[PDB]
Write a protein that binds this ligand. Structure first.
Ligand code: MG
Ligand code: ZN
Ligand code: ZN
Lengths: 1183, 319, 48
DNA sequence: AGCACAATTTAACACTTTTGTCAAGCGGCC
DNA sequence: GGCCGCTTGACAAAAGTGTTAAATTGTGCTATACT
């Protein structure tokens, strides 16, 4: 059949003897004096004891066997375990045991009535009195009370852990009651918490079998694995494995007990010799509480027992999910060079012989070359250096067949992609430059995992979506990526920075005077006005829109037009002033795509420069192109983008950054103000502290002035000469990076926290005073330990993001939801009570192609409801926002949809990539992680706030807020500067300490009460005194502030689709027929219990609030969860009860082996597409 | 902090014995199996059935009494005598315990933890206290003090991080160990393997002496320190892919063969399934006898080899 | 320090050697073995 | 630190026999 | 008459049963010292 759902939970002790049957016992000897393998005990091959001469009877047929001595046609030689499972039995029959029972009071305390001491009896050190015969001391009992001697005071009676098995049926018959008389404990508060947990644990045993077999009475390990043979190589030898020795402390103990018990063995001797047996159980399960090192009493390495290794932390769960081991790929260095811009790649011309060897062998079989496939495996091994004909047949195989190039580490969706292998020379694997901006890494010897897809159904599934010429142009986040990265920008920026070299201001009677005279000396081709224009009258480039401006590029080639934009009149489409330099740009993009008609109305002219706008040109072009042509651009801007800079050259000489000749005296006035604040001390004025910050602000301002003077000196005169600005404006330079070199930047702060006294005498050209560098280093330390510390905690937080949003996939078609969200067009500023334009940078990416909740009327045409408001509509609303017609643009966010198992159709406006609506199959659940999967490295963990709200952890100072909206009420005293809020009702007492105690008045819903300036009280209180109204929005607004501080491109619903997961769980109150009054049912699934039953029972609920890590421990499935930091409690709660895993889930399929429910394997794309015309015609009658 | 303390508090909570209550209660054992032996040969219970089964009843703290009540005219005292002597398996064996523990603190290292050593140790009392010669006027005391360590040495050799080390290996290992440490303390450098032969005697050269330190004593690797060591070569993927391939190649290389030759090789060189039948069994079913069916075997070595020197295929041997 | 830590066992080993036996083999060369203060002192340079 | 006795058990190796393979002889066919 | 093929006889090489020699356990038990 076909794999589908999955089942688990506990298994009765009788079921344990089912899978294992028998074959066990005997010591755990891993060898003998001779015959290292067999041992007839530990890992003995089932029915293999030297020469059993049997067992082969169970097998029907297939082959012969029974060879008397040595071995027959058994598994030992072949099929031995075959990596398959092989349970033993470990026999066992002692008093009792324990399956760890986790550390969340499971299988005990909850189903019983004892804590912090439930182990005292489970470890054979107490007495769980489970009998009634009327005591004496203080009446009888029914639980633990006989702590030694007590149980003998009367001399049933159970002092061992064996009682755990006795409370099986005793709790089973009372189970029905444990669900009735237990729930009988109505409110009363306090204890109404235990009754909830006790009912959840007993709710499992309430149905679907599952008995309290927690009291293990016979374990069953594994033998096939652990057994590593001799491993020489290099300089070493010997070998072995675990799981065996650490297991020897279980069977042997069970046997020795069978030898002691059988003979004369008094109580005391058995009680301790038994507790060690269960200890061995937990020992084989998980080593904790005390541990069990090797070579006792000496301490060394902790024995590996599932914990952290296998079924636990990174060891056999983190490595098997994704970080497996590809059996078809390789690694190499990185290189760059004009290949063809996308559509191609590098990849060696030697190793490729192995990656594409398979099909390559079959090709030669028919191409005369190799006589057979086998022979083709012995012509390329001894490095005979073929380099003959084979390199040709290899091309046929590498024709239209793409390859997947990966980058480590990985970040966002832009971390893989695919190209077409174009074997070059050597071994270095090169790629296109632009692609680097997606991996974030400088070429310095880095590698790239080169994966290769085999199946042809994987090739088309790749080159059609993973091709760099598709899923790279317009990435997620918000802004484009394929845009011309660094370098390229400077290749077109070096020709549009004006040529005004200052010539003066003469005048001619229509070019008959200062035309020839000035051509001799003074006044060249800069200013000077005549008739109307200026010096533009000199080289009139005629031509036309026939074959580009001839006279233009023609004169430039010769010793005429200096190019580099020297101001010249062309003819193009009209008498302009654009220089032949810009003409080139428009000519490059012209022939590239098709006719300048598009680039003409797109490319600007008023403010050319080619600054940080190259991302808008290509972006705006997509609307009139669409990959096919778009790709051509990034290719045209390539060739010229580098050649122009090559056949020109621009070096960074030590003088290239001319020192501000008008700076020296500036420091004089700044230093002349030093004594000013210094002599104030000798006169006893202004506290030493006031003096401190007084001088700080001084240099904090002058620095900006000096930077301004420099940036200015580098603006007017010295245009193209200064490269430090050519990249600072828009290419590959930082503005604050300039004030460092020619500047003087020295406002460094002490290592702890206190800006030093005197700054730093930067001016690199002049070596520091040997003290300046040591002083500036104190601050240049946090700028490296923080970025590197982005793998300590922050790096282990992104996982939490990918776990939460997982089963979120865009499917179905038109769900139909009323309630909608109204995105704010204007935000407030804590500083001053006044809304701002939100800087536009937030509104744009916040409404980029959405779903207008309702008709939008705003001067002119209306924006129909459900209309995909592209970038155009956005600008139309922003520019019309200043007018005063719109304040809250209506829209539909993923936060409004009755579907927790699936995303939503057409609701997630635009698939932010192909410039169109999302496609059914786009796992936004993973894309949402790709959005946040980038800023991580660009943060400051050394304080952390983004995760604070996620886990809903109460922020610093709690930031107390008004839970209710009363009135003013502002009373002050001595130390009780607390503020209250009430109105004709009850008054709460907010012990407001001493800090942000503002006035304010007229009550307040929540706001902040004044003290909570930022990071309002944990969402717990919000939703508690508000609901899923502010919770779902407060995050999308606050959380982004941490991103807006660094100007992030991502935004939109990428972060608005992950919130619905943390707010899709509800509680229970007076349920209908459904058990558990407490409960913790999910959203949609709960709506079902109130949808079908609505045609009858009231099933009210309350919008609960869970963190980000909590949305994993308790989910609709189990395969997920764990990981984080609790791969122990998960499998517990997950077990016991039925808790049947769902089906629709990326992981569920990847792990189990099923196909992806998303991608091309979605339930919306599994039909037929084969019909060569006549096929449909034939079947038409064949039916 | 180990669980040994819990037992250390239960073992050191009950007092040992005075001095005279050691023999007065011991004699109960002697007359015990004796009074029990009365019914033994009386019905034929080997005197071991009346003891093992009765002792199980002596510990009511957790049947045969039937016929033990019909006591004839000559039986009525033996009853009380059997139960009176039943108290022999009562108090005794509750003291030695404490007197024990303070001994396992010696073998704290060799093998098995302190807690484990307790087992094999105290267990040595179960059989020691039993075989006590109440005759001699020495009084039981520091005797079982030995029946424990001897059980420990007989245990540390039985149980260890090895495989199977009898009384002929542990005693030799420690002997080669003390010697290696004996010559070391009387040389200045670590003695080789052969240089230790003279230290022993006859039979001990350098090979066998190396075979002793070859097996183990406690090594066998630290199991899996720091998925420790990879290494693997059993269910080789390519070997399996080439397994069927090399097989298919033969299925194809046999297409130029005749039944009265191919099948002959099939049954002869055990291929059909696994039966390595010989020309004798291949001649009975193939009409003709030996020779010519053997002249076809050679004909196969040649007629087939003649199809190899011209057709590359000698690359299937290295597999 | 490591040397000391290693020499610590030697002292502990001598004690055990003084608790058992008397005339058989008890000489300042037999009670001291070049294994504890050695192997434990060598594993420091090879692994630490 | 451990030796023996006994007892008993485990392990392996060697024999005489049998089986298989090769060469020679006889018969049949051309 | 000759050549080829088939069958039988002889020789050589490798197994089932027998035979004996080497190792473990128990127990015995030893044994010695201390209380
Ligand atoms: Mg690097
Ligand atoms: Zn067999
Ligand atoms: Zn929807």
């Amino acid at each position: 059949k076909e794999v589908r759902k999955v089942r688990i939970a506990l298994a009765s002790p009788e079921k344990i003897r089912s899978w294992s049957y028998g074959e066990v016992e005997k010591p755990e000897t891993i060898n003998y004096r001779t015959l290292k393998p067999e041992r007839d005990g530990l890992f003995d091959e089932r029915i293999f004891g030297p020469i059993k001469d049997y067992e082969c009877a169970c097998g029907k047929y297939k082959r012969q066997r029974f060879e008397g001595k040595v071995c027959e046609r058994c598994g030992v030689e072949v099929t031995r375990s075959i990596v398959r499972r092989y349970r033993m039995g470990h026999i066992e029959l002692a008093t009792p045991a324990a399956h760890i029972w986790f550390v969340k009071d499971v299988p005990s305390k909850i189903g019983t009535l004892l804590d912090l001491s439930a182990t005292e009896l489970e470890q054979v050190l107490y007495f769980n009195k489970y009998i009634v015969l009327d005591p004496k001391g203080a009446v009888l009992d029914g639980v633990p009370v006989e702590k030694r001697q007590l149980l003998t005071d009367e001399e049933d009676a159970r002092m061992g852990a064996e009682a755990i098995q006795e409370l099986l049926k005793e709790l089973d018959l009372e189970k029905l009651e444990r669900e009735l008389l237990e729930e009988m404990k109505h409110p009363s508060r306090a204890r109404r918490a235990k009754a909830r947990k006790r009912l959840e644990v007993v709710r499992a045993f309430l149905d679907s079998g599952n008995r309290p077999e927690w009291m293990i009475l016979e374990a069953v390990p594994v033998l096939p694995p652990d057994l590593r043979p001799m491993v020489q190589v290099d300089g070493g030898r010997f070998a072995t494995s675990d799981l065996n020795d650490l297991y020897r402390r279980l069977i042997n103990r069970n046997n020795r007990l069978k030898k002691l018990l059988a003979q004369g063995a008094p109580e005391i001797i058995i009680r301790n010799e038994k507790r060690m047996l269960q200890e061995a159980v937990d020992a084989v399960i998980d080593n904790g509480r005390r541990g069990s090192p090797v070579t006792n009493p000496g301490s060394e390495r902790p024995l590996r027992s599932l914990t952290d290794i296998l079924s636990g932390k990174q060891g056999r769960f983190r490595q098997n999910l994704l970080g497996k081991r590809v059996d078809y790929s390789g690694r190499s260095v990185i290189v760059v060079g004009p290949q063809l811009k996308l559509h191609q790649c590098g990849l060696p011309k030697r190793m490729a012989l192995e990656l594409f060897k398979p099909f390559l062998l079959k090709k030669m079989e028919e191409k005369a070359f190799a006589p057979n496939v086998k022979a083709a495996r012995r012509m390329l091994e001894r490095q005979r250096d073929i380099k003959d004909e084979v390199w040709d047949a290899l091309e046929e195989v590498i024709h239209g067949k793409v390859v997947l190039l990966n980058r480590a580490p990985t970040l966002h969706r832009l971390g893989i992609q695919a190209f077409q292998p174009v074997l070059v020379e050597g071994q270095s694997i090169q790629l296109h430059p632009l692609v680097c901006e997606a991996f974030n890494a400088d070429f310095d010897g880095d590698q790239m995992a080169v994966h290769v897809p085999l199946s042809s159904f994987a090739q088309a599934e790749a080159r059609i979506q993973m091709l760099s010429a598709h899923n790279l142009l317009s990435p997620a986040s918000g802004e484009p990526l394929a845009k011309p990265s660094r370098d390229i920008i400077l290749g077109l920026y070096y020709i549009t920075q004006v040529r005004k070299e200052k010539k003066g201001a003469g005048m001619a009677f229509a070019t008959p005077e200062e035309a020839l005279a000035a051509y001799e000396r003074g006044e060249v081709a800069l200013n000077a006005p005549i008739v109307v224009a200026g010096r533009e009258t000199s080289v009139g480039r005629l031509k036309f829109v026939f074959a580009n401006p001839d006279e233009a590029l023609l004169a430039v080639a010769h010793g005429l037009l200096d190019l580099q934009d020297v101001v010249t009149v062309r003819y193009l489409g009209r008498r302009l002033e654009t220089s032949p330099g810009r003409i080139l740009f428009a000519r490059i993009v012209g022939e590239a795509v098709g006719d300048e008609k598009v680039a003409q109305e797109l490319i600007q002219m008023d403010v050319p420069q080619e600054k940080n706008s190259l991302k808008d040109l290509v972006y705006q072009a997509f609307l009139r192109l669409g990959m096919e042509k778009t790709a051509r651009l990034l290719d045209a801007l390539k060739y010229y983008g580098f050649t122009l800079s090559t056949t020109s050259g621009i070096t960074i000489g030590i003088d290239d950054a001319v020192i501000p000749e008008e700076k020296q005296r500036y420091l004089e006035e700044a230093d002349r103000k030093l004594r000013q604040i210094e002599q104030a001390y000798e006169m006893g004025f202004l506290t030493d502290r006031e003096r401190y910050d007084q001088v700080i602000q001084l240099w904090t301002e002058t620095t900006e002035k000096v930077t301004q003077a420099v940036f200015k000196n580098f603006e007017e005169n010295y245009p193209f000469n200064p490269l430090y600005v050519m990249a600072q404006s828009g290419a590959r330079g930082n503005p604050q990076q300039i004030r460092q070199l020619c500047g003087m930047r020295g406002l460094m702060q002490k290592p702890s926290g206190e800006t030093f006294e005197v700054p730093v005498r930067s001016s690199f050209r002049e070596g520091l005073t040997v003290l300046e560098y040591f002083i500036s280093s104190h601050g240049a330390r946090k700028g490296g330990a923080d970025t590197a510390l982005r793998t300590a905690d922050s790096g282990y937080l992104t996982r939490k993001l990918v776990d939460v949003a997982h089963e979120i996939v865009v499917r179905e078609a038109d769900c139909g939801t009323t309630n909608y969200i109204s995105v704010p067009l204007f935000q407030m500023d804590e500083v001053t009570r006044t809304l701002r334009l939100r800087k536009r940078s937030d509104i744009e990416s916040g409404l980029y192609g959405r779903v207008l909740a309702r008709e939008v009327e705003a001067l002119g045409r209306r924006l129909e409801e459900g209309r995909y408001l592209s970038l155009e509509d956005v600008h139309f609303l922003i520019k019309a926002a200043e007018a005063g017609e719109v304040r809250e643009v209506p829209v539909r966010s993923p936060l409004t949809c009755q579907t927790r198992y699936g995303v939503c159709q057409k609701c997630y406006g635009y698939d932010l990539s192909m410039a169109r609506p999302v496609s059914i199959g786009e796992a936004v659940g993973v894309v949402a992680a790709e959005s946040i999967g980038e800023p991580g490295t660009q943060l400051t963990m050394r304080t952390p706030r983004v995760i604070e709200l996620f886990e809903a952890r109460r922020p610093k100072a709690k930031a107390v807020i008004s839970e209710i909206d009363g009135v003013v009420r502002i009373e002050e005293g001595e130390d009780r500067l607390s503020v209250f809020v009430e109105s004709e009702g009850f008054s709460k007492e907010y012990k407001l300490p001493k800090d942000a105690r503002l006035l304010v008045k007229d009550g307040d819903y929540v706001e902040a009460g004044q003290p909570l300036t930022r990071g309002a009280i944990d969402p717990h209180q919000l939703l508690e005194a508000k609901g899923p109204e502010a919770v779902e929005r407060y995050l999308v607004d606050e959380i982004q502030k941490v991103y807006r501080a660094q100007g992030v491109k991502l935004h939109d619903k990428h972060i608005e689709i992950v919130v619905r997961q943390m707010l899709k769980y509800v509680e229970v109150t007076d349920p209908g027929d459904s058990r558990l009054l407490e409960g913790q049912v999910l959203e949609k699934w709960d709506v079902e219990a109130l949808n079908e039953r609505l045609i009858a029972v009231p099933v009210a609920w309350k919008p609960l609030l869970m963190g980000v890590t909590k949305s994993a421990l308790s989910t609709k499935s189990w395969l997920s969860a764990a990981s984080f930091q609790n791969t122990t409690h998960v499998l517990t709660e997950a077990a016991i009860a039925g808790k049947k895993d769902e089906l629709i889930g990326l992981k569920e399929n990847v792990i189990l082996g099923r196909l992806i429910p998303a991608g091309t394997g979605s339930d919306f794309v599994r039909f037929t597409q084969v019909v060569d015309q006549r096929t449909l015609k034939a079947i038409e009658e064949a039916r | 902090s180990d669980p040994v303390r819990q037992y250390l508090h239960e073992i050191g909570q009950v007092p040992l014995l005075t001095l005279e209550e050691e023999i007065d209660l011991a004699r109960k054992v002697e007359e015990g199996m004796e009074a029990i032996k009365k019914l033994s040969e009386a019905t034929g219970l080997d005197q071991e059935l009346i003891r093992e089964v009765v002792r199980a009843k002596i510990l009511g703290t957790a049947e045969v009494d039937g016929k033990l009540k019909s006591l004839p005219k000559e039986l009525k005292r033996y009853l009380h005598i059997a139960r009176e002597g039943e108290a022999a398996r009562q108090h005794l064996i509750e003291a030695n315990l404490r007197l024990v523990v303070s001994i396992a603190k010696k073998y704290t290292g060799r093998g098995l933890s302190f807690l484990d050593l307790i087992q094999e140790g105290n267990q040595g009392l179960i059989r020691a206290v039993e075989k006590f010669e109440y005759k001699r006027r020495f009084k039981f005391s520091t005797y079982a003090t030995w029946w424990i360590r001897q059980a420990i040495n007989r245990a540390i050799a039985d149980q260890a991080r090895t495989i199977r080390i009898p009384v002929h290996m542990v005693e030799t290992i420690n002997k080669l160990s003390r010697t290696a440490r004996q010559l070391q303390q009387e040389l200045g450098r670590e003695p080789s393997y052969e240089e230790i032969a003279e230290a022993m005697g006859p039979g001990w050269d350098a090979k066998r002496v190396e075979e002793t330190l070859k097996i183990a004593q406690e090594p066998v690797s630290l199991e899996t320190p720091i998925d420790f060591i990879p290494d693997e070569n059993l269910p080789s993927p390519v070997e399996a892919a080439a397994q069927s391939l090399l097989s298919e190649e033969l299925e194809k290389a046999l297409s130029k063969l005749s039944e009265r030759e191919a099948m002959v090789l099939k049954l002869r060189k055990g291929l059909i399934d696994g039966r390595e039948h010989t020309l004798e069994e291949v001649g009975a079913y193939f009409g003709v006898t030996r020779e010519r069916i053997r002249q076809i075997e050679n004909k196969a070595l040649r007629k087939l080899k003649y199809h190899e020197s011209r057709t590359r295929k000698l690359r299937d041997f290295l597999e | 320090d490591q040397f000391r830590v290693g020499l610590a066992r030697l002292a502990r080993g001598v004690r055990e050697r003084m608790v058992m036996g008397s005339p058989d083999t008890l000489t300042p060369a037999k009670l001291v073995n070049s294994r504890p203060l050695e192997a434990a002192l060598r594993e420091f340079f090879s692994r630490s």
